[PDB]
Design a protein around this ligand. Structure first.
Ligand SMILES: O=C1C[C@@](O)(C(=O)Nc2cncc3ccccc23)c2cc(Cl)ccc2N1
Ligand SMILES: O=C1C[C@@](O)(C(=O)Nc2cncc3ccccc23)c2cc(Cl)ccc2N1
Lengths: 304, 304
């Protein structure tokens, strides 16, 4: 028992991290097969970042201007291309530590592990969620650019996120591995509005099921609700509306605990209207929305 | 910016995890050089665990009864010995993935990363603290035994914890890598009292400094205090007494923020006496004690 914000083991991703330098800018790159992926802002100077013309800036660059270092050995760049907001540097050596992998674009509300890196070196691993507004509440400093987000299914690493920037608000923005930003964000040093964020309702319900599985049951009540009634409350508290799709994904947890989804919704409704009254759930004094129903079942069943 | 409960990258430890079977019991082992370390309860049956005579039980076992599997290849056991609560299985092959390592016994209040494993396979990584009462609030299911806790300093892995058991209270207990339990715990299926736990005061102060570094400053007040006055409050709220040693370790954070340690103590005193009033600090509605002053500086400076 016990419930922790658990990240995937980072080993398969650590073997892919490289350092990419172009001019005076150094950031992280992801080496898979004979290709290194990194943010396209690696080609910028400080004056360029205010309004960069990436096409023009990349033209002034040659393969030899991209210094790729894997650990302490240098990689030879034989090709360069821009795909949306990432650069793909073709190297002459295939990474011998390339795991089985996929590039996937995650949906908001889904979770992933981030391997924070500096100078191509892994420094830490943490679990986070893609916010409904397409930002991530990470932990990233200057040089962290190029760090990736991923999920692991047995031996396959699904890369879903590459870190690009920190908005003036302190939240983080980035792309999938094809260079498409999640959200309305652009890779420019400009004020950018992230939308109104909401709480991931299905995840909070999954975490309430994890609390029940782990003995924390004080919040359970003698009430039930309807999807429509619950959603009136969810709207008032900036929670994502619950759909039958969310109810269906909560099926396994509803079966394991024997608590119908709408009964757990009623518990959540009372928690939202009345607060925690100074109590905690799984060691937290607020409602946690960074565990999906899949995460809760995985952790509560020990999937390796 | 941003502050996350970050674990160390688990790659160096994943390369050491093996599966150890003895009779019908399977748990995790740690393969370093030509030695596999695992909990000595691997030699027990269910009836044995109530009051095991480990010396007698181990006598009935031979090298060939210990099945050690690294990934999918079998290791040949050429020696077996019990050291306190761990078994050391000498194998004829040195682990080619053995990182530079040390066995260290951590002090209560210190933190470490856990690589949760099942059947010798890593399933997740999370950061936790050794509670002042020598328990850990982990996330462990049956089969997790043998999972280890560690810290990483550049290329050196300091192993500090091996998981042994879950107490009836849901908290976790285990040993250092020499088999010495942290706390009064014994490896028996018996009711065991963990002492009264306290909050790691120096860690909460470090986390308050991390909040200040990250912009969350609402809790800062126009007050100061003395070590003696603050400790009267710490005693009342089950917080560890603050010593000049803790003040000295907070030095770097006091210098970075320009907030004297006793001024931060006064902020903490008001937070303890008056609560959070429905506000949050670094996304948390309670006072976090699982980040040491070293963790805060490391994360806030990006040490790889
Ligand atoms: O300040 C910058 C540099 C930049 O490379 C960046 O934000 N990176 C970092 C990434 N993540 C977190 C950070 C925290 C502290 C400083 C830097 C961070 C950058 C890139 C873009 Cl596409 C737009 C604006 C900027 N503005
Ligand atoms: O139930 C048991 C089996 C035992 O191997 C154990 O607790 N392991 C597990 C370890 N960690 C978490 C768990 C959670 C759920 C079940 C098992 C857990 C065990 C070992 C000892 Cl030295 C004493 C009592 C016991 N009692």
């Amino acid at each position: 028992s016990g419930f922790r914000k658990m990240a995937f083991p980072s080993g398969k991703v650590e073997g892919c991290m490289v350092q990419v330098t172009c001019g005076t800018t150094t950031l992280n790159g992801l080496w898979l097969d004979d290709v290194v992926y990194c943010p396209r802002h690696v080609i910028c100077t400080s004056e360029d970042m205010l309004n960069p013309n990436y096409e023009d800036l990349l033209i002034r660059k040659s393969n030899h201007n991209f210094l790729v270092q894997a650990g302490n050995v240098q990689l030879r760049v034989i090709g360069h291309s821009m795909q949306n907001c990432v650069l793909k540097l073709k190297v002459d050596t295939a990474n011998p530590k390339t795991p089985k992998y996929k590039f996937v674009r995650i949906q908001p509300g889904q979770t992933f592990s981030v391997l924070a890196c500096y100078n191509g070196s892994p420094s830490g691993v943490y679990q986070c969620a893609m916010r409904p507004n397409f930002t991530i509440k990470g932990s990233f400093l200057n040089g962290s650019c190029g760090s990736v987000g991923f999920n692991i299914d047995y031996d396959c690493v699904s890369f879903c996120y590459m870190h690009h920037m920190e908005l003036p608000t302190g939240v983080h923005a980035g792309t999938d591995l094809e260079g498409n930003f999640y959200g309305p964000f652009v890779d420019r040093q400009t004020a950018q509005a992230a939308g109104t964020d909401t709480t991931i309702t299905v995840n909070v319900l999954a975490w309430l099921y994890a609390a029940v599985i782990n003995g924390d049951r004080w919040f359970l009540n003698r009430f039930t609700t309807t999807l429509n009634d619950f959603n009136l409350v969810a709207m008032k508290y900036n929670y994502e509306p619950l759909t039958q799709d969310h109810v269906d994904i909560l099926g396994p947890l509803s079966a394991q605990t024997g608590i119908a989804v709408l009964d757990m919704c009623a518990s959540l409704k009372e928690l939202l209207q009345n607060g925690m009254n100074g109590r905690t759930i799984l060691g937290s004094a607020l409602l946690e929305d960074e565990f999906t129903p899949f995460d809760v079942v995985r952790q509560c069943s020990g999937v390796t």
